[PDB]
Each structure stands twice: as C-alpha cells, then as structure tokens.
Amino acid sequence: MQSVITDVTGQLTAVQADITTIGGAIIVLAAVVLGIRWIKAQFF
Amino acid sequence: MQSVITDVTGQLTAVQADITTIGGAIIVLAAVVLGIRWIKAQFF
Amino acid sequence: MQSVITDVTGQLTAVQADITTIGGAIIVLAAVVLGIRWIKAQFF
Amino acid sequence: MQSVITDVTGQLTAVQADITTIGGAIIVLAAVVLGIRWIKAQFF
Amino acid sequence: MQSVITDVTGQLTAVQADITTIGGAIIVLAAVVLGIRWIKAQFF
Amino acid sequence: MQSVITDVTGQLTAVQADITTIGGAIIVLAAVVLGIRWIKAQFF
Amino acid sequence: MQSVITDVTGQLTAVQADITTIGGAIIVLAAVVLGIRWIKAQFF
Amino acid sequence: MQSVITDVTGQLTAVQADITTIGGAIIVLAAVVLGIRWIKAQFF
Amino acid sequence: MQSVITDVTGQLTAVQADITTIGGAIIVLAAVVLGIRWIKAQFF
Amino acid sequence: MQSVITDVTGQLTAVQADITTIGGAIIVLAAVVLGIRWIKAQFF
Amino acid sequence: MQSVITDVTGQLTAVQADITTIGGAIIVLAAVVLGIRWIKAQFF
Amino acid sequence: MQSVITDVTGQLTAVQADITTIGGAIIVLAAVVLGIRWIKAQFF
Amino acid sequence: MQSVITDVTGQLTAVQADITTIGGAIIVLAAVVLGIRWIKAQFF
Amino acid sequence: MQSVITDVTGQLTAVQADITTIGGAIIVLAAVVLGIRWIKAQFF
Amino acid sequence: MQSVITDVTGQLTAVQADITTIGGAIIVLAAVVLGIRWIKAQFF
Amino acid sequence: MQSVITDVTGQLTAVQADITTIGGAIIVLAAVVLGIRWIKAQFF
Amino acid sequence: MQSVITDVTGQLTAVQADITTIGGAIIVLAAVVLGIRWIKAQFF
Amino acid sequence: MQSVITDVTGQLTAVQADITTIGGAIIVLAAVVLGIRWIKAQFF
Amino acid sequence: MQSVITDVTGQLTAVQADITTIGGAIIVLAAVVLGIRWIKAQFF
Amino acid sequence: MQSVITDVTGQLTAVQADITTIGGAIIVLAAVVLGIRWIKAQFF
Amino acid sequence: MQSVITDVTGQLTAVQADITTIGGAIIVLAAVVLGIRWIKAQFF
Amino acid sequence: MQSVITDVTGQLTAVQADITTIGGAIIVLAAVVLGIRWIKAQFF
Amino acid sequence: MQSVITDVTGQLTAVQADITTIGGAIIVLAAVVLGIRWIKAQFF
Amino acid sequence: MQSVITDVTGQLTAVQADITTIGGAIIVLAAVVLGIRWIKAQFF
Amino acid sequence: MQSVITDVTGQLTAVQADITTIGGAIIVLAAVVLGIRWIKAQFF
Amino acid sequence: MQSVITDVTGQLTAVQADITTIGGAIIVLAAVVLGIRWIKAQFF
Amino acid sequence: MQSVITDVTGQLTAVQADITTIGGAIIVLAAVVLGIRWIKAQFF
Amino acid sequence: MQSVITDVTGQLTAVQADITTIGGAIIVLAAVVLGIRWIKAQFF
Amino acid sequence: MQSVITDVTGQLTAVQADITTIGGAIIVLAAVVLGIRWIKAQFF
Amino acid sequence: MQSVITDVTGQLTAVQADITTIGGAIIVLAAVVLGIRWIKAQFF
Amino acid sequence: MQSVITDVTGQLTAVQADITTIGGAIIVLAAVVLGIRWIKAQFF
Amino acid sequence: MQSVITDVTGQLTAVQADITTIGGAIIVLAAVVLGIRWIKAQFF
Amino acid sequence: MQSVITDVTGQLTAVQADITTIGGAIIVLAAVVLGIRWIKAQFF
Amino acid sequence: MQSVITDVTGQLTAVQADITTIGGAIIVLAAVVLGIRWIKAQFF
Amino acid sequence: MQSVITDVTGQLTAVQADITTIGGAIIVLAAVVLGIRWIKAQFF
C-alpha cells in the first residue's frame, strides 16, 4: 500500500542527512592532510 | 474469474509506486556518498 | 460427457487471462526494483 | 537515524585534530631539512 | 582518537632532533670545503 | 425428481460466493506478506 | 450459507492488520542493518 | 487476532535496539581501521 | 532480546582494542620506513 | 579477543627491527655515493 | 622476521663496497682532468 | 437437539485457547532462531 | 482442555532456552571468523 | 529439553577453538606476504 | 572437533614457508633492479 | 605445499639473471653517455 | 626466462653503438668551438 | 479401563527415548556437515 | 522399544565418520584452490 | 556405511591433483605477465 | 577426474605463449620510448 | 589460444612504428633548441 | 595505428619551425650584446 | 507366522542393495557437476 | 529385485557422460572469458 | 541419454565463438585507450 | 547463438571509434602543454 | 555510440584553447624575467 | 571551459607587471654597482 | 493378465517421448537466459 | 500422448524468443553503463 | 507469449535512455575534475 | 522510466558546479605557490 | 549539492592566505641571501 | 587554516635573522681578503 511507500521515504530522506553529516566530518581531515603536506614541500 | 485478474492488477500497480518511491529515497544517499567521497580525493 | 470437457475448458482459458494479468502487474515491480538499484551502483 | 549522523560527526571532528597534530610535527622536520641544507650552499 | 595525535607528535618532534643533528654534521664539511678552496685562490 | 436437482443447485451456487468471499480475504494477507518482506531485502 | 462467507471475511481482514503490523516491526531492523553497515564501508 | 499483531510488534521493536546496539560496536572498529591506516600513508 | 544487544556490544568494544593495538604496531614500521629513507636523500 | 591484539603486536614490533636494520644498510650506500662524488668536484 | 632484517643487511653492506669501488675508479679521472688542465694555464 | 449444539460449542471455544496458547509458545522459538542467525551474518 | 494448552506451553518455553543456548554457541564462531579474517586484510 | 541446549553448546564452544586455531595459521601467511612485499618497494 | 583445528593448522604453517620462500626469490630481483639502476645515475 | 615454495623459487632465481643481464646492457650506455659528454667540456 | 635476459641484452648493446655514434658527432663541434675561439685570443 | 491408559503410557514414554536417541545420532552428522563446509569457505 | 533407539544410534554414529571422511577429502581442494590462486597475485 | 566414506575420499583426493594441476598451469601466466611488464618499466 | 587436470593444463601452457608473445610486442615500444627520449636530453 | 598471441603481436609491432615516428619528430626540436642556443653563447 | 604516428609527426615537424623561429629572434640580441660591448673595450 | 517375518526380511535386505546401487550411480553425476563447475570459477 | 539396482545403475553411469560432456563445453567459454579479459588489462 | 550430452555440447562450443568474438571487439578499445594515453605522456 | 557474437562485435568496433576520437581530442592539449612550457625555458 | 565520440571531442578541442590561452599568459612572465635579468649583467 | 582560459589569463598578465616591477627595482642596483666601481678604476 | 502389463508399457514408453520433448524445449530457454546474462557482465 | 509432447514444444520454442528478446533489451543498458563509465576514467 | 517479449523490450530500450542520460551528467564532472586539476600543475 | 533519467541528470549537472567551484578555489593556491617561489629565485 | 561547492570554496580561499603568508616569510630570506652575498663580491 | 599561515610566518622571519647573521660573518672575510691583497699591490 501507500503505507509502504511514503513511509519507506520518510526514512530514506532522514537517513541522507546522516550520511552527508558523516561525509563532511571526514572531509575536514582531507583538508588537513593538505595542511600537513603542502608545508613539507615548501622546504625542499 | 475476471474478478481475480483486474483485482490482482489493481494492487500490482498500486504497489509499484510504493517500491519506486522507496528506491528514490535510497538513491539520494548514493548521491550523498559521492558528496562525502569526491571531496577526500581532491586533497591527495 | 462432452458437457464436462468443453465446460471445464471454458473456465481453464478464462482463468489464464486472470493469472497472466496478475503476473504483468507484479513484473512492473521488478522493473522498478532495478530502477531503485542500478542508481545506487552509479555512485560507488 | 540522527543517531548515526551527529555521532559519526563527533568522531570526524575529533579525528581531525589528530591528523593535524601529526602534520605539524612532521613539518618541523621540513623546516630543519632547510636548516641543514641552506648552510651547505653558503660555502660553494 | 587523541591517542593517534599526541602520539604521532611525540615522534614528530623526536625525529626533528635527528634530522637537525645530521644536518649540522654535514655543514662542517661545507665549512671545510671553503677551507681547502679559499686557500688555492690566494696564490693565483 | 427435478426437486432434488434445481434445489441442490440453488445451494451449490449460494455456497460458491461464500468460498470465494473467504478466499479474497485471505489473499490480502499474501499481499501483505510481500509488503513486510520486499522491504527487508532493500537493505541488504 | 452467507453466514460462512461474510464471517470468514470478518477474520480475513482482521488478520491482515496483524500480519502487516508484524512486517513493519521487522523492517525497522533491516533499516538498522543498513545503519550498522553503511558506516563500516566509509572507513575502508 | 490483534493478539498476534501488537505482540509480534512488541518484539520487532525490542529486537531493533539489539541489532543497532551491535552495529555501533562494530563501527568503532572501522573507525580504528582508519586509525591504524591513515598513519602508514603519512610516511611514504 | 537485550541479551543479543548488550552482549554483541561487549565484544564489539573488546575487539576494537585488538584492532587498534595491531594498527599501532604496524605504524612504527612506517615511522621507520621514513627513518631509512630521509637519510638516502641527504647525500644526493 | 585480546589474543588477536597482543599477538598482532608481538609481530608489529618484531618486524620493525627488520625494516630499520635494512634501512641502515642501504644508507651506508648514500654515505658512499657522497664519497665518490664530492671528490670529482674538487678537481673542476 | 629477523630473517628479513639480518638478510636485507647482508646485502646492504655487500653492495656498499661495490658503490665505493666504482666511485674511486671515477675519481682517478677527476684527478686526471686536473692533470690535463693545470698544464694549459701555465703557458698563458 | 440444542443440547448437542451449545454443548459442542462450549468445547470448540475452550479448545481454541489451548491451540493458540500452544502456538505462541512455539513462536518464541522462531523469534530465537532469528536471534542465533542474524548474528552470524554480521561477521561475514 | 486447558490441560493441552498450559502443558503445550510448559514445553514451548522450555525448548526456547535450548534453541537460544545453541545459537549463542554458534555465534562465537562468527565472532572468530572475523578474528581470522580482519587480520589477513591488514597485510595487503 | 535442556539436553538439546547444554549439549548443542558443548559443541558450539568446542568448534570455536577449531575455527580460531585455523585462522591464526592463515594469518601468519598474511604476515609473510608483507615480508616478501615491503622488501621489493625498498629498491625502487 | 579438534580434528578440524590442529589439522587446519598443520597446513597453515606448512604453507607459510612456501609463501615466504617465494617472496625471498622475488626480492633478489628488486636487489638487482637497484644493481642495474644506481649505475646509470653515476654517469649523468 | 612445498611444491609451491621450492618451485616458486626455481623461477625467482632464474628470473634474476634475466633482470641483471638486462641492467648491465643498459649501463654500458650510461658509460657511453659520459664518453660523448666529458669530451664537449674539454673544449670550453 | 632466459628469453627475457639474452634478448634484453641483444638490444642493450645494439643501442650503445647508437648513443656513442651520436656523441662523437657532437664532439667534433666542441673541437670546432675551440677552432673559432683560440683564434680571437691571438689578436688581443 | 485404566488398563488401557496406564499401559498405553508405559509405551508412549518408552518409545520417546528411542526417538530422541535416534535424533541425537543424526545431529552429529549435521555438526559434521558444518565441519566439512566451513573449511572450504576459508580458502576462497 | 529400546531395539529401535540403540540401533538407530549404532548407525547414526557409523554414518558420521562417513560424512566427515568425505568432508576432509573435499577441503584438501580448497587448500589447493589457494595454492593456485595466491600465486597469481604475487605477479601483479 | 563405510562404503560411502572411504569411497567419497577416493575421489576427494583424486580430484585435488586435478585442481592443483590446473592451478600451476595458470600461474606460469602470472610469471609471464611479470615478464612482459618489468621490461616496460626499465625504459621510463 | 584426471580428465579435468591434464586438460586444464593443456590450455594453461598453450595460453602462456600467447601472453608472453603479447608482452614482447609491447616491450619493443618501451625500447622505442627510450629511443625518442635519450635523444632530446643530448641537446640540453 | 594462438589467436590471442599472434594477434596481440600484429599490433604490438604496428604500434612501435607509431611511437618511434613520433619520437623522431620531437627530436628535431631538440636539435633546434641547440641551434638557437649555441649561437647566444658565441657572443658572450 | 599509423593514425597515431604520421599524425604525431605532422605536428613534430610543424612545431620545429616555431622553436627555430624563436631561436633566431633571440640570437639577434646576442649579436647586439657584442655590439654594445666590443665598443667599450676600444677606449680602455 | 515366522513365515511372514523371515520372508518379509529376505526381501527387505535384497531390495536395499538395489536402492544403494542406484544411489551410487547418481552421485557420480554430482561428482561431475563439480567437475564442470569448479572450472568456470577459475577464469573469473 | 536386482532388476531395479543393476538397471538403475546402467543409467546412472550413462547419464554421467552426458553431464560431464556438457560441462566441458561450457568451460571452454570460461577459458575464453579470460581470453577477452586478460587482454584489456594489458593496456591500462 | 547421449541425446542430452552431444546436444548440450553442440551449443557449448557454438556459444564459445560468440563469447570470444565479443571479447576481441572490446580489446580493440583497450588498444585504443593506449593510443590516446601514451601520447599525453610524451609532452610532459 | 551467432546472434550474440556478430552483434556484440557490431558494437565493440562502433565504440572504438568513440574512444579513439576522444583520445585525439585530449592529446591536442598535451601538444599545447608543450606549447606553453618550452617557451618559459627559453628565457632562463 | 557516436554520441560519446563526437561529444567527447567537442570538449577536447574547446578545452585546448583554454590550456593554450593560459600558457601564453605565463610566457609573457618568462619574457619579463629576461627583461629584469639581461640588464643586471650589463653592469658587471 | 572558456572559464578556465580567460581567467587563467586575467592572472597571467596581472602577475607580469609584478615580475617586471621587481626586475626594474633590482637593476637600479646594477646601475649602482657600476657607480661604485668605475670610480675605483679612475685612480689606478 | 499380460494384457495389463505389455499394454501399460506401450504407454509408459509412448509418454516418455512426450516428457523429454517438452524438456528440450524448456532448456533452450536456459540456454538463452545465459545469452542475455553473460553479456551484462562483460560491461562491468 | 504425442499431443502432450509436440504441443508442449510448440510453446517451449515460442517462449524462447520472448526470453531472448528481453535479454537483448537489457544488454543495451550494460553497453551504456560502459558508455557513462569509460568516460570518467579518461579524466583522472 | 510474444506478449512477454515485445513488451519486455519496450522497457529495455526505454530504460537505456535513462541510464545513458545519467551517465552523461556524471561525465561533465570528470571533465571538470580535469578543469580544477590541470591548473594546479601549471604552477609547480 | 524517464523519471530516472531526467532526474539523475538534474543532479549530475547541479553537482558539476560544486566540483568546479571547489577546483577554482584550490587553483588560487597554485597561483600563490608561484607567488612565494618565483621570488626566491630572483635572489640567487 | 551547493552545500559542497560554496563550502569547499570557503576553505579554498581561506587556505590561500595561509600559503601566501608563508611564501612572503620565506622570500625575506632570499632577500637576505643577496644581502650576505653581494657584499663578498665587492672585495674581489 | 590561519594556524598554518601565521605559524609558517613565525618561522620564516625567525630564520631570516639566522641567514643574515651568517652572511655578515662571512663578509668580514671578504673585507679581510682586501686587507691581505691591496697591500701586495703597493710594492709592485
């Protein structure tokens, strides 16, 4: 029934935010991996 | 009888929408898994 | 008698249409299960 | 659920500091590789 | 965790001293390359 | 006599409706067994 | 008689709700199996 | 009866918590697999 | 039951320590790969 | 279990010594590459 | 194992001699480049 | 007589409770078969 | 009679414990299949 | 009966040791795959 | 049974030697790749 | 089995000779690059 | 196989001649750069 | 008479032991089917 | 009678050995599937 | 009977040789994939 | 049967030649990449 | 089959000519870089 | 294909003219650096 | 009479051999289904 | 009777050949799937 | 019967050609991926 | 059938042209990267 | 399809202009590096 | 896109002015090095 | 009588052909299910 | 009767075409999955 | 019936366009990943 | 359906802008890496 | 989403300032390398 | 972050003083080279 659909959706969206919130958090690390590494280069 | 057929159909279609509505919801997550991950790459 | 045969047939065919009409309806769901799922893949 | 997201975040940030703290430490070496090497040049 | 960071640091600093200690040692050679060479000049 | 026949019929038909009315009711359960189960799959 | 039919129905519907109510409950587990598992992936 | 439904539910929810509680526990390992591995990279 | 959850957890945490203890051990090698290699550079 | 951890460690350390012992050996070559090359310079 | 280390060493040293033996050979050329060139100067 | 009917009923109902009481008891096993088995999966 | 019910129950519960006790025992194997396998990965 | 449970357990544990004993044995290979491979790298 | 374990082990160890014996053989090539290549450098 | 090991070795050694035989051949070119180039210098 | 070695050699030598043949050709230019330049000097 | 009952019982119990004794015997095979099969998996 | 039980057992055990003897035989193949396959990897 | 076991074995071993004989054959290809590829590298 | 083995071999060898024949062909390109590139160098 | 080999070769050679034809073309530029640059020198 | 070669050539030549046209232009400057400088000399 | 028993037995055994003789014959097919299928795997 | 057995066998063997003859045919495809695919790799 | 075998074969071979014909077609793309890519390199 | 093969081919070729047409387009960029860069050099 | 090719081209060309437009811009700097530097020389 | 080009240019020009502005500044020093030095000459 | 036997046979054989004729027809579908599916794989 | 056979066939073939017609349609998607994906690669 | 085939096709084609339309969209990102990255290079 | 396509596109484009917006931001750093570095050169 | 873009930018700019601030700092050293060195010249 | 910049600066300045302090020290030597040399002149 519709029950299944609108309700499988209510979650499918709700979980997105979770996924994306976790991705951002990880990226700040990439951003910092380039912090620690652009610097080494500058010397050599 | 026809009773069985047209009526087994009335549902078979009605349930599709449910299935598909749930699929879309999940895909937005895939779309976001590529949000969190294309970004990491950019650093390295 | 023939009564039995031609008349058991009149139904055997009439019920087919019902069976098949119900099968089509279900397949549109399979078709949609591949809608929701080919998409996830594309990300990863 | 949100459980997943805010909690995957609580770590994603917490780990950044670790990454960056390790990068700084390494850079002080680059800074010193230029200590030992600018000096050789001065002679020749 | 912090475990990673403060501990990746404990080394990053500890290794600096090594790098720099090795650089000084090499420079004393540059200093001596200018010993052997300023002298030749003086003749000509 | 005919008494027996037309009258055994008056029931044979009358009872059909009962049988079929009970079958439909049960099928809505099958329809729901596929509600609860197509969903689990989607996760894994 | 009709007795049989309308009354076999009164149950056939009443039991549906039970079946479906049990299915939903189980699905929330699938939904959580994808909670615990999408997360592992993110690391590797 | 309703007996079946509300009672199949009382469990379906109760078991979720179990599933999810087990998932979290496992993820902390993923989180640590990225502890042990981001570090190796930093050297090379 | 809860039995499953709190008990699947008692392990999920207990195994983390194992994973992480093994990661640290490996990293000390990375740390040493940079020992053997920063040195070669210094010559050339 | 702990079995995994303390025992994955017993090796992680044991292998370090191997790695480092091999690095030293190679460096003595760098040290000699600067033997053969500082000399050529002196002429020109 | 130790196997790796003491054995990676047995070579690291053995190859040094090769490197250095080749360097000496080349230097005798530098020594001779200064043979052919100090002489030209003397005229002018 | 009515004797037969109301009295065949007094039992037909009384025995239901027995049947159903036995069914519940068995289901708690199914519920536990999913306890022991969802867990294995989680590893692999 | 009730005899049947309360007594079919006395077993239905008694057997649960058996089922579940056997499930736990098996899971400790899954837990160990992940012991032997997370380790291989770490190398490659 | 309990017979089933305590006795299905007596094995479930007894077999664990077997599984784990086999896992350790395999891991020593992973440990050696990293023996043969870290070495190649060192050259290039 | 123990049969499985001690016997899965008898092989797990026996195969290690094979793996490692093959790794050594390959490394002698790395060792030689550095033979052919350190030499080219010396010219330029 | 041993089959794997002694036989993976029979090749690992056999291929070395090939690698090294190819390296020597290339080096004679380096040796000649210094033939063509030390000469130009002599003029200027 | 030997195939690789003796055949990588057949080229390594064949290409030498090419390299050296090209070097000689260039040197005749150095020889001429000293033709055009020793002459200017003679005037001043 | 009671003759029938207590005596039909004296057997009903006596035969149980037989049934159960035969079941255990068979299960040891299941236990061994998992011996021969968990092992194959480990390879692949 | 007991006849049934002790005698259904005499076989249930006797057949185990057969099952297990066949499992071992098959596993030696798994063991060899990992012979032929770990090797390919080593190249690439 | 034993018939089953010793005879399921007579094959389980006989088939091993087949499996392994096929694996060796394939590996000689890996060995050659490293023939064609180590060579390209040498140029660049 | 042996059928499988000797016949899986008849191919495993037959395909080697193909692989290797293709590798040689590619290498002649590497050999030529060093033709076009050693030359540029000579100018600068 | 041979199909693969002789045919992978038919290309491997055919592509060489392309590679080499492109290299020559580029070298004429090196040859000209030494045209434009030997000249500047002559002045100073 | 030939496509690659004759077409990589069509450019390799076309670009030469560019390189050489730029070299000539620069040389006229060298020619003029000797204009401005031979003159100063004449005084002193 | 005994007539019935010993004579119903004379057959019960005589027919076993038939059953078992037919089972063996079929199994050789299973054995061959694993012939045709282990092979496909090896490719992929 | 024996009739059943020796005659159920006459087929059980006769059908094997069919099964196996069909398996070989399919494998030649696997063998070719590795024809078309090892080749792609070689490029990249 | 033989019917099954020789006829399952008539196809197993017939389909090979199809598989292989499709593989060749794809490889010409790999061959071209190396067309477009070896070229970029040449510049840098 | 042949259907599969000749038709999988009709595409395999048709797609090549696409791949190659895209490669050429990209190379013109490499060709231009050497436009912008050979020029900088000329100054210094 | 062609779709891919002509359209991957429409960009490959369009991006060239971008690359080249950026190169010119940079070269004007080289041209100016020779502005600031030819001048210093003139003094000394 | 054009975006890249016109915008990489907007900078390439903007940076020129910087380069040249810095060159002029330095030259005034050359101009002054000839101030301090033409004067010494005049005495001697 | 024999009447029964030879005549029950005349059919038992006659019907076989029917069964088998229907089986072949179905298999051509399996053969085609592998047509449509081996193809998808080739892409991914 | 034959009725069954030739008529079960008339369908078995008729349905093939359907199966295969559906397979082709799906494959064009695989063909396009490789359209969208070979392209991404080209960039990176 | 044909019903199945022509109708499974009507979709198989209709879905292609969807797949391909999604692929193009993604590629424009690859095209832009090379926008952001060719640029960084130009500096260094 | 079209649903999938036009909607997978609506994102594929929307995400481009994101990718490109992030690339520009990074390039301004390259542009600045050449700020800090062209300057050092000017001294030496 | 835009989320990704404007936010990847907010950093890309923020990090520039860091890069450039570090470059200036280094240049003041170049400026001083010309302090210590123009002076030596003045003597000789 | 700013962290990087202000902190890369804190050093860039701190190191200047070092560079300059070393330059002064060297210049006092130039100053003395003119001490020892103006004197010789005075005689001749």
From Swiss-Prot, chains A, B, C, D, E, F, G, H, I, J, K, L, M, N, O, P, Q, R, S, T, U, V, W, X, Y, Z, AA, AB, AC, AD, AE, AF, AG, AH, AI:
InterPro entries, sorted: G8P
Bilayer topology: Single-pass membrane protein
SUPFAM superfamilies referenced in this protein's UniProt entry, alphabetically: Inovirus (filamentous phage) major coat protein (SSF57987)
Keywords: Capsid protein, Helical capsid protein, Host cell inner membrane, Host cell membrane, Host membrane, Membrane, Transmembrane, Transmembrane helix, Virion
Pfam family, one: Phage_Coat_B
Transmembrane segments: 19-39
Gene Ontology CC annotations of this record: helical viral capsid; host cell plasma membrane; membrane
Record's keyword annotation contains Transmembrane: yes
Subcellular location: Virion; Host cell inner membrane
Coiled coil: none
Topological domains annotated Periplasmic: 1-18
Cytoplasmic side: 40-44
Protein's job: Self assembles to form a helical capsid wrapping up the viral genomic DNA. The capsid displays a filamentous structure with a length of 760-1950 nm and a width of 6-8 nm. The virion assembly and budding take place at the host inner membrane.
Similarity-based family: Belongs to the inovirus capsid protein family.
Subunit structure: Homomultimerizes. There are several thousand copies of this protein in the phage capsid.
Name this polypeptide is given: Capsid protein G8P
Gene: VIII
